[PDB]
Symmetry: D2
Subunit: 311 residues, 4 copies
C-alpha cells in the first residue's frame, strides 16, 4: 500500500490527478491546499479524511511521497522542502521557471538520494507507446523521423511562458535524444506584435530527425504526431485515433472503446510509473537526464529568441 | 491558333501532355520521336498528320513553338537547337542534369530573345492556387509557413536522380523566395544501403518558413501540402481535397466535381500559361529566376550530400 | 443533497454508474449486492460505509432513491419492492424482458405516485443534444429524418436478448414519435445460422422518417447517427466527433476537449436528470410514455420475428 | 474495327462520351446533331471527318451502331428510327419518359432482333466492381445489405423528372433482383413547397436488403454506397475512395493514382461493354430484364407518389 500527499489543488490537480488517484486502489491520499473552502469540498467529494492547509503539516502523516500541482512560482520552494526532508517528490512541468533552478533542484535531490519525478504525460500516451516502442523506451530506436505538432488558435504569448509552459510538451516528447543546447539544431520562429506566435525546433542525431512544432496563431487548436521508420509510418491526429501506413496501404489504429479520457492522455500510465519510482525510491538516470536536457534546451531556446529579438 | 511540335513522346508525354494538347482547340500538333513505331501508334491514336523522327525536320512544318519531353540527358541539346533558331521552347522539368547547363540554356535564351518555359505543374494546381494566392502569385505574401511533402513507398534512389528528377517538385513548389543555395538553410537526409532514402530541406525567408520534405522510404505513397497564415491554415492530402482551419473550426475544401484528372494536377492550367508565354514570345523575369534558383538549389543539395556521404 | 442506494453491482455498474456517482457532489452512496466479496472490494475502492447484501436492509439507511443495476430478470422484483415502499426508483435499460411487466411496473408506480426512471443514456448524448434540439427536447421538430446505426462485429444472438438488451438502444433513441407497435412500420431482419444477425426497423411519423439499424454481424463495431433537416444534415461517427453539412459545405463538429469519457456517453447528463427527477418525486409524462412505447415496440418486434421464423 | 454514330451532342456527350470515344482505338465516329455551330466545333476539336446534321443522313456511313445522347422527349423517336432500320442502339438514362414507351421500344428491339443498351454507368464503376463482385455480376449474391445514397443540396423537383432523370441512378444500381413494382417494398418520401425533396425505396429480396435513397434537399451534394456481407462491410464516400471494415479493423481502399476521372465514374468500363455488345449484336437477357424492371419500378414509384399527393 502507498500513502501520497497532493499539494496545490488547482485546475490540473482537480481535472486529472485527483480523479485518477482517488479511485486508485491501495493508495491513501492526503489533500493539501491553501484555500480551506476548496480543500473541504474536494476532501468530501472524494472522501478524504487526510486534510491539510499548511504543506508543512504534511510531515504529520508519514507520507511515502508528495505530488506538487501548484503554480511554477512555488515549485522549487515546495519541492526542496520535501526533498531535503527525505521524501520522493513529483512535480508538474515545468520543474522550475529556469534551467539553473532545475539543476539545483536535482542537485538537492541527489544530495538526499531522493527521486524527483517531473510530470510529462506525453511520454506515457497509451496509443502512441503501443505502436511506437521507441517512445515507451524513450530512445530513438529505429525511428527515421518524428514530428510533434501542438498548435493553438489565436493565442500568442511572451517568450518565456510560451516555451517553458507549453512548447516544452512537444519539445520534450520529441527529445528522444538528450539535446540540451542549440548545437547542430535549427531554431525558427515568428513573432506577432511583441509576442511569440510559432516556434520550430528541429535537429538530427544519428539516423533520426526529431522535430518539435508549435504554432499558436494556427487556424485551429490541435495536436498531431507523425513518425516514420523504413517503409512504415504513423500519423496520429489525436490521442485516441491514428493512421498506420505500410505496404502502401492505410489502416486506422485506435484505443479500445470505453478507455477513459484521462487514460488516453496518459495520466493513468504516468501515475503508474510515478508510483513505481516512489516505491523503489529511485528514478532511472536517463529519465533524470531527459528532464534536465528538455529544461536546458528550453532555456537555450528562450535566451536565443530573446537575444535575437532584443538585438 | 498555334502550331506546336512535340519532341520526345515518352511516359509523361503520353500520360499527361499529349492527351491534354490533343484536346486543346486551335492547336496543331506535330509529333516527333525517335521510335517510328511509337510515333505512328500515337499519331494514329491522336489522328495527327505532321509526323517526324528527326527533331531537325520539325522546322519543315513551320512550328510556332516546341515542347521537349525527352530524357534529361538530351534537354540541352534539343533546347539549344530551337533556341538558336529562335523558337519559344518548352522543356519538362528538370531543365537539365546540372545548374551549369541550366544557366547556359537561359543565357542562350536571353541572347536570342526567346522564352524558355520549364514544366512545373505544381505551380498551377487549381485547388491550391484557389486558396493560396501566394502560389498563384509565386510570392511569399502572408504565408507564415508552407510545407510540401511528397513521399513514396519503398523506393530509394541515387542522389542525382532523387534530387533532380523527384525532389525538384516539392523543392521548387516551396521555393517562393527564389532560394539558390544553402545559406541559412537546414538540410537533413538519410542514406540507406547506398541510396538516398529521405531528404528534408527547410529555411526561413523573412516571416515565412519554407519546407520541402521527401521520404522515398515512407509507409505509403502520398503528397501533402500544409500552409499557414496568421490564424489561418490549410492541409491538403491530395490535389482534390483538403481541410481549411479558421476561427478554430475545420471545414472541407475541394475541387469541383467532374474536373478532369489531368486538370486537377495542374496540367491544363500550365499548358495554358505556356501557350500564352509562347504566343507572347515573353516569359516574366521572376519566373525565370525561380527556375534558375530551384535548379541551382538542387545542384547545391547534390554536391553536398555526395560530398558528405563520401566521408 | 441526496442518499442514493445502488442495488446490483454488475459490469455496467462498475464501468459507468458507480464511477460517476462516487464522484458526484452532495450524494451519499449505499452499495448493495449479492456477492459480499465484490461488495466489499468496490466499497473499499470507492470509500463507502453504507454496505449491504440484502436489498431489504437498504431501507435502514433511509435512502432517498434506489438505482437497480441487477440482471433484467430481477428488475420487476426489486423495482416493485421500492416502488411500493414509495421511493423514486431508477432501473437500467431494459426495464423488463416484456412489455407486460413494463406496463405493470408503471401502473404500480402511478398508484404510489413515485417516479420510475429508465436508463437510456443515448438520450443525453452531450454532443448530439447540443446540435440537434429535437433529441434534447425529445420531439421530431424539424427533423426530416433520423437514422441511428449501431453495429457489432461477429456477435449474433437470440431474438430476445438482441432486442431487449441491445437494439432497444438505437430503437428508443430514434423513437421520437412514441411508436408502440408495427403500424405503418417496415421491419426487416436476417437470421444467420440460428441467431439474429441484423435488424432494421423504420417508419414515418408525419414529415419525419425514423430508422433504427443494427447489424451485429458487421465488418466492424461502430455506431453512426445521421440526422437531416431541410438543406441541413449531420453525421456522427462517434459520440465525440461528427460532420455538419450546410450550404453545401462540410464542417467538423466535435465535443469539447477534456470531457470525461463517461460524460461523452451521456452518463453524467443522465444521472443529472435522474437526480432532479428523484429529488422532485416527479417524472414528466412524455417521458414515461416514451419508455412504455419503446418497450412495447421491442415486444412487438420480438414477436413478429419469433413467429415469422418458426412459421 | 468499329464505326459508331453519335446523335445528339449535349452536355453529357461533350463531358463524358465524346472524350472517352475520341481516344478509343479502332473506332470511327459520325458526329450528328441539330445545331451546326456546336457540330463543327466538336468535329474539329476531336478531328472527326464524318459530319452530319440529320439523324436520317446517317445510314450513308454504314454505321455499326448509334448512341443517342439527346433529351428524353426525343429518345424514343430516334431510338425507333434506328431499331427499325436494324441498328444496335445505345440510349442514355432514362430510356424513355414512361414505362410504356420503354416496353414499346424493347418490343420493337427484339422484333428487329437488335440490341438496346441503356447507359447506366453506376453498374461499371471500377472501384466498386473491384471489391464488390456482386455489382459486376449484377446479382444479389452474398450481399446482406446494399444502400446507395445520392443526395443534392437545395434541388427539389417535380416527381417525374426527380425520379426518371435522377433517382433512376441509385434505384437501378441497387436493383439486383429486377424489382418492378411496389410489392413487398417500402416507399417513403417528403414534399416541400409543392416539390419532391427526398425519396427512399427499400425492399428485401431473399437475404439481401436493398435500399435506394435520394434527398435532394440535403445539406450537401454527395453520393454514398454502403454494402454489408457477413462480418464484412464497405463504405464509399466517393467513386475513388472508401473504407473496408473486416475483422473489426478499418482500412482504406482506393483507385490507383492517375486513373482518369471519366474512368472512375465508370464511363470507360461501360463503353467497353457497350462496344462488346454492339459488335456481338446480342445483349444478355438479365441486362434487358434489369433495364425494363428499373424503368417499370420508376413509373410505379411515380404514379404512386403522384396519386397520394393528389388524393
Ligand atoms: Ni435546433
Amino acid at each position: 500500500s502507498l500513502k501520497i500527499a497532493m499539494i496545490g489543488l488547482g485546475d490540473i490537480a482537480q481535472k486529472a490527478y485527483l480523479p485518477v488517484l482517488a479511485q486508485w486502489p491501495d493508495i491513501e491520499l492526503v489533500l493539501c491546499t491553501r484555500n480551506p473552502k476548496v480543500l473541504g469540498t474536494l476532501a468530501t467529494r472524494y472522501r478524504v479524511s487526510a486534510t491539510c492547509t499548511d504543506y508543512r503539516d504534511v510531515l504529520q502523516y508519514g507520507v511515502d511521497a508528495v505530488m506538487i500541482h501548484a503554480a511554477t512560482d512555488v515549485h522549487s520552494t515546495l519541492a526542496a522542502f520535501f526533498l531535503h526532508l527525505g521524501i520522493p517528490t513529483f512535480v508538474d512541468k515545468p520543474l522550475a521557471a529556469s534551467a539553473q533552478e532545475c539543476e539545483n533542484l536535482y542537485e538537492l535531490a541527489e544530495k538526499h538520494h531522493q527521486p524527483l519525478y517531473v510530470g510529462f504525460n506525453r511520454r506515457h500516451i497509451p496509443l502512441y507507446n503501443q505502436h511506437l516502442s521507441e517512445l515507451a523506451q524513450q530512445e530513438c530506436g529505429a525511428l527515421r523521423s518524428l514530428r510533434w505538432e501542438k498548435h493553438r488558435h489565436a493565442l500568442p504569448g511572451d517568450i518565456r511562458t510560451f516555451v517553458f509552459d507549453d512548447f516544452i510538451h512537444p519539445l520534450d516528447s520529441v527529445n528522444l535524444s538528450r539535446q540540451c543546447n542549440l548545437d547542430d539544431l535549427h531554431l525558427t520562429y515568428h513573432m506577432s506584435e511583441g509576442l511569440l506566435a510559432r516556434l520550430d525546433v528541429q535537429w538530427q542525431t544519428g539516423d533520426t530527425l526529431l522535430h518539435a512544432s508549435m504554432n499558436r496563431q494556427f487556424g485551429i487548436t490541435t495536436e498531431h504526431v507523425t513518425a516514420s521508420y523504413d517503409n512504415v509510418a504513423y500519423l496520429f491526429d489525436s490521442f485516441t485515433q491514428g493512421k498506420m501506413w505500410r505496404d502502401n496501404q492505410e489502416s486506422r489504429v485506435a484505443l479500445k472503446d470505453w478507455t477513459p479520457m484521462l487514460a488516453s492522455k496518459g495520466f493513468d500510465a504516468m501515475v503508474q510509473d510515478w508510483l513505481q519510482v516512489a516505491a523503489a525510491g529511485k528514478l532511472p538516470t536517463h529519465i533524470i537526464e531527459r528532464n534536465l536536457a528538455s529544461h536546458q534546451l528550453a532555456e537555450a531556446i528562450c535566451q536565443q529568441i530573446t537575444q535575437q529579438v532584443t538585438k
